[model samples]
Target chain A: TVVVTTILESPYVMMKKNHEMLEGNERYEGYCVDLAAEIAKHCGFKYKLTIVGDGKYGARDADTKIWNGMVGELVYGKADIAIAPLTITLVREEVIDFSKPFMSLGISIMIKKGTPIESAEDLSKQTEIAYGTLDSGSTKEFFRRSKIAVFDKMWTYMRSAEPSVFVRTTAEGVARVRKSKGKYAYLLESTMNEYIEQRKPCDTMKVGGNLDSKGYGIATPKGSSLGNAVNLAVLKLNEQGLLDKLKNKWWYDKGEC
Target chain B: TVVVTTILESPYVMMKKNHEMLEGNERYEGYCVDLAAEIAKHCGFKYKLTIVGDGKYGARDADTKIWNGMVGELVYGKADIAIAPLTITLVREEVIDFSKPFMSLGISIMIKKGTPIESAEDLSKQTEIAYGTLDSGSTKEFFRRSKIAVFDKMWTYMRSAEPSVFVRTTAEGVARVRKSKGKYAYLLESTMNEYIEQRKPCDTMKVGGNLDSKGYGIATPKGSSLGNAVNLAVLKLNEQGLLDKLKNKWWYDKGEC
Candidate 1:
């Protein structure tokens, strides 16, 4: 049996409200969970689900000079496939194989409603308006590696900012923004941004267009045998509307997150 | 046996100089050619190489509403894999599987040396200095689908320009730029731009920054068993320095455009 590895991220992947009543994989659910099942069916394989060993999902560790989480699993051959909301990046692409994206998404800023920040340009230009992102996340990396004129300027600001930014999780960043009222902004994915926007106290809003264009793909070890089958399964699911249904079910219908 | 389909494109896929002296797949060569071979070796599969039946690699036939070439072959289940300079686009990704990118590239503008146009902003701002893309290719599609303000504005100018700005091929576009001296600019991939810049008369120079960020991938039919193996093969080649070696061989050492 193939081992399908993933991460525990809300809306995308999380435990159900009555998860205790379920057994095996049923106890865990998310957009990629359903997608993984569909892909297994199409590929004619049975698989077991497991969270990443280290708990962190795909981040560049400067100390180790390696990527971890589902990305690490795929890179080091611990998992056969990774069906996570893994953002496609140039550096990651160099090591693992990702199917054509199953979802389109990008890095965006999240702020409490009525926040003064209107656009990235404004964020880049202002200093008093403190902003930050999940410490080891793709959003943070985007700012760090950006070379685009506006983003490059923004990165310069973020790199040397005082008080040293904040948060280790997206949820923490969201909380920081909420607690700060209009003083702080949290940068995150559009998916997470939309999810947070729907919750109570709903103080957060996605600002500006996406900072950049990137997508989420099913990942596998470079040269894994299952790559094509999984990619096709995603396409079929998208065409048959299964993917959309799963998104709506988990992101909007299911009250788990 | 898997049928690996591709297209005739310089540096990516092309007929060998002594193609007539070779037989079957040996006659075909390029970055994708070597990449496909490496993947097949890793996957332990026998494969055959064939060109796409349609001349267009991956494009929408505005009239017929159908996609053609290697992209089409994969979508229709005619081939198991496609190895070429096939770009990763949202629409195409919807139908096929693309491994993590094998190379980083983007659409860029090339002009006769000493041209006044230094950037896309400059071209978009000036009406007299006309610039266009290869008539029906990925570069054109990028502008057509772009949401950026400057790109959208440039697209409007290209679609409604008085002289009808567009060329059928990159060669034609580059020739027009040379003929126009300083009045025209040609948009294409950075790789192609660099190749042309080094050729006879050496009149062309890449100008401005890349218009967009994207990468080229080794493509496979969605759900094909070979996808995983191919993706990994690409990564191994990249890490082994083989990819860079091939790039130099085709773009520099071979000296065949």
Candidate 2:
């Protein structure tokens, strides 16, 4: 039986009641849960859901030179595929194959309701705004490795800022933006930004166009035999309107208690 | 016999004794000649080099909606492979299979010595210095199809400029840059830029980092068994320092004239 490795993220994949007693694929449920089930039906495989060993599911460990979490599982052959909020990047593309995006998104800056900053360019030009992105995440990496003129400049400012301005999670960065009045701006995914905008005590709004174009993909190991089948499965789900239904069912319908 | 189609561009494929006569598999000849020979050797095929019938080798026929040239030869099954400075782009990649990059370059601006402009940013911010890229080539298509902010802005400015500022060929663009008396910049491939930098009236130099990263590749039909062999040959040639040797021998040592 193939193992389906994923992270514990809201509305994506998480354990249900009595999850500890359940075995195999039945133990978990989320958007990817339904997706993996459909894909298993088409590909003719019995699979089990396993949480990635580390909580940081999709990051490159600089010191060890290994990708861990969902990325690591695919690389290490512990899992057959990954159906999660895995953002596509050039570096990751070299090692793993990704299906055509199931979702389109960009990293966005969320500012308090009356913050003067309106875009990345505006933040880049100012020092008082003290904007930062989530650490060890795609948004931080985008700015860190960018070669574009404006982006390169922004990277320099962010990397050298005092008090280690970058936060380890979207939650922390969002809280900083909310509590700091107009002094801080939170950089996060547009998907999460939309959710935050609708929440209680929501004083933040996404500014400008997204900073970069990135999308979530169903990841398979490079040159895996299952790549084509997984890609086809995503397209089939899209055609049947199952993908849209899942988004609404999980994202729009769920709320943080 | 497999027909290998190519174009008449120096350092890629060009006539020797007579402008009409063609040569293949020769050292210090051209990039495409060596690439074609290597591909044939690896793929276990004997092939003949056939120059495209239309002198305008790769142009968009507005009425017919087809690409003609060596590119046309492969598309029409008249040739099994095309080895030239055929750029690998999204449009072309959709129709044909291309190996890993044989050469990497980007569109860059060239200006005559003593010109005021030093970079694309400098050129973009000023009105006194007039500049344009080749019409209907990959370089022009880059700016046209790009969604990036700087490139999008450049496309808008170039498309509606008076007197139709674009040139029909890289040669024409270079001529304009040379003769414009410090008032014009010519945008073209970095390879061509370096070639022209050493040519007569040696007063022009390439300025600015490239606008984007692109590569040339050996192209064949989708699912063609020859693709892997050709790709391996390119990698071998690159690893053995043969590719660099050929570039210097053909483009740098030999005069463009």
Candidate 3:
């Protein structure tokens, strides 16, 4: 079995609760879940989707410089593939092979429905609303050490933002958005932002276009046999209107809690 | 009548045609164009939308200490209102008054199809693919003034990059993203990026979410009588859902062909 590792990020990979009693691949459903089934069927491979044991999307530790998360799973040969929203970065690609992105995404504005604050720069200039990227996440770190002045100005504000505007998780940020009475905003990948826009209570919308852009890919070991075939499958998915069509169905409908 | 100053920024403000024969503001149409009409109706004011003679969004030159663009138009009392995608930054706010954001946007990654390049970080480490911000404007200066590590490193790279990665103007940069055949990218605000995404020769797509989070504001000279009413008009439009509808009609839909 080609072991594919991924995280439980909704709309991408997730545990199939009905799947607990179901057999191997039968236990999951998502954009990547359906994607895995189609890819395996096309590539003629028996695949087992494994939940990443580490419970992280993957990043290099600042001190140890060791890779963590799903990227580590592939780097250490713990899995044959990673089919999730693993961002395709140069550092990651240097160590792994990423198939064409299954879905392209970027940073988007996630504001509570009533906030007058509409953009990053607007937030940067004022003290009324408190906002932060996911603390200790790429977005947080991005703003923390940001270079562009809009962000740099924001970073200065966030760094010095007393009463702690930062959140440890995206959920915390989202919760802050909901509970703050229109004061907090989250910066996250567009895929998740849009996914939430369709979810419960539905007070949030992925307003404005994406700010920072990138894609999530199906990754493989740097030189695995499955790489090319996997790439072709994704490219076909992008071409046949397969991904776009499937994206709207369950991901949008079944996405809500 | 309020003399609202604006720039010719596409999809935000532009010259109206079929209407040198037009009367007053009838000569214009866009997200902000419609925005102006709605704000005027809601606030109970007679207003005039005038293009900034110097087509700019407003920036103070470090060299000459001169202001240009819509922000400058307001600062010098040449105009009383700025209903455009003028970014609300700390420096701008120090010199002018702003309403709640009329629109939300940020720096998005623009890419031509068929390229593996995706993230700004991805572009940071590469020599083959060239990228830059608009040679002049808040965006270009953002990199120039940025101290954030990612952009800082990138700025150094682009600053010293051979064959020079910087483009002299936005149109030149957009043309490069098209002509360079997936080899070039321009980092711009989401409003404009979304506008271009719906443009002809649909080969270019906004790949990642925006890097920054911010909004454009309708500006006035600090504390003008128009500020309170303008802010309320914007807030009311937002509350009543007129802004989202107009935004979709102009910036989001397959843009005016």
Candidate 4:
């Protein structure tokens, strides 16, 4: 049986009602949960699903070169595959193979309703409003490595802000925006921001076009035989409209707004 | 030296004026021209660009099982790489390797100004306005393979339309829309539609969000050593904003609208 490493992110992977009483794959349910089943069925495999040991998506230590989270699990042979909302990045691609994206997303702005911002350009020129991203993710890496003048300037303010703009988790960033009374904006993936926009007490909304474009992919250790089958299966699911249907089922069918 | 197979599509690859006075790479110019230079510079290689002999983007003949156009060039070992507005699709991915997408686009609608349509569903339900896609391309394939109700219905109408709704080229489709007096619309990639919307006539517009999302990726023959370097170089160029700059240089700086 293949070991699938995933994360406990809401609407993608999460505990079901009475999950504690359930065992094996039946314990969890969400978008990725359904997707994992489809992928396994198409490829004709039995699989075991396990949550990532570290809650982080995955990142490499700058000095140690050691990977963490779901990516590391695949790289270090702790897991056979990763089916989480794992992003495909240049750094990660060097050590693992990613199937063509199952979902497209980008860094986006989440602002409390009535915030006085229309674009990233608008945020870059203003001083009154504060914004920050979840630490140690692609969004932060993009700003850190960006050479675009607008992004470069915004990165400067975020790195040196007096109150410390960065947050340890996406939840912390969202809570900051909701409680800061429109003074703070959260910079996160459009997928997560869009999901929150449909949740109860929906006081936040995604504004402006995505800052960059990328996608979430299924990942495996480089040179794995499973890579080819998984990639083809993803394409089949996407072409059949099953992926789109799953997105609407998880993000909208259960919508509160 | 690597042989790069490309196509002579407007604003991506084009013959420069006074072509008789030029030699080699200097004979052509456009967005891909600038991009090819940056890619070679970063990857530290020299290449000769050749126009795809068939001029078709690339497709498999259903009966013969033989590939044609640029993809065929790579698969049959005539070209070392392909750096054009070539799309990344599942079928192509099986026979060749593609770098991470250097550009993102999607299937979109092109309508003459003041057309009565606002969405694909609207077009699917109406009979007055005629619409179709370029023959022998991904757009046609998408409609044919689609299982979604709206798209499946559209494929049926396009396949049966009298006088043939399909056009041999993107320009032909655009021209049909231009001269149809608001009775015709063209379905094509968002990249091309956006380019035409900025050209001299400026009488057309891209209406509605893209119907499906995908991207254009640089491709190499399967297992070629050049794939990894090219992929990393593309990510670097995208991050440095050079890709965006080149797009503006070719699309907007030379805009007529």
CA error at residue A240 for candidate 1, angstroms: 22
Each model's lDDT comes to 0.77, 0.74, 0.75, 0.89
Give per-residue CA lDDT, model 2, range A150-241, as digits (tens): 77788899899987779978789989999987999887898778767766676888888766545577889988888766766665565444
For candidate 3 chain B, which ten residues in a row score worst on lDDT? B235-244
What is the C-alpha lDDT profile of model 1 across B1-257, one tens digit per residue? 88888888776678888988899889987777887777788779998998888855786678997878888888888888887878766568777777766665667988888888888998888887788987776788778966667888899999988676799877788899889968888888988887787667878899887765566787887677876667666656654446656776777776533
Q: Give model 1's share of reference contacts.
A: 0.04
Total residue pair clashes for candidate 3: 24
Candidate 4 C-alpha error for residue A93, in Å: 1.4
**Candidate 4 ranges beyond 4 A from true positions:** none
Off by over 4 Å in 3: A1-257
DockQ value of candidate 3: 0.02
lDDT of 1: 0.77
DockQ of each: 0.06, 0.03, 0.02, 0.47
**Which of the CAPRI classes, incorrect, acceptable, medium or high, describes model 4?**
acceptable
lDDT for each residue of candidate 3 in B1-257, tens digit (9 for 90 to 100): 98887667777666777878889888887777778888888778888888888887788999998998888888888988888877766567668876656566667878887878767788877868888886666676667766556777778887887777778777787888999978888887777777888888877777765565555677888668876677656655653446666777776574643
TM-score top scorer: 4
Identify the candidate with maximal DockQ.
4
TM-score of each: 0.56, 0.54, 0.52, 0.95
Model 1 pairs whose backbones collide: A222-B232, A223-B228, A223-B232, A224-B228, A228-B223, A228-B227, A229-B223, A232-B222, A232-B223
Instruction: List interface RMSDs for the candidates, in order.
Output: 9.4, 12.3, 20.7, 2.2
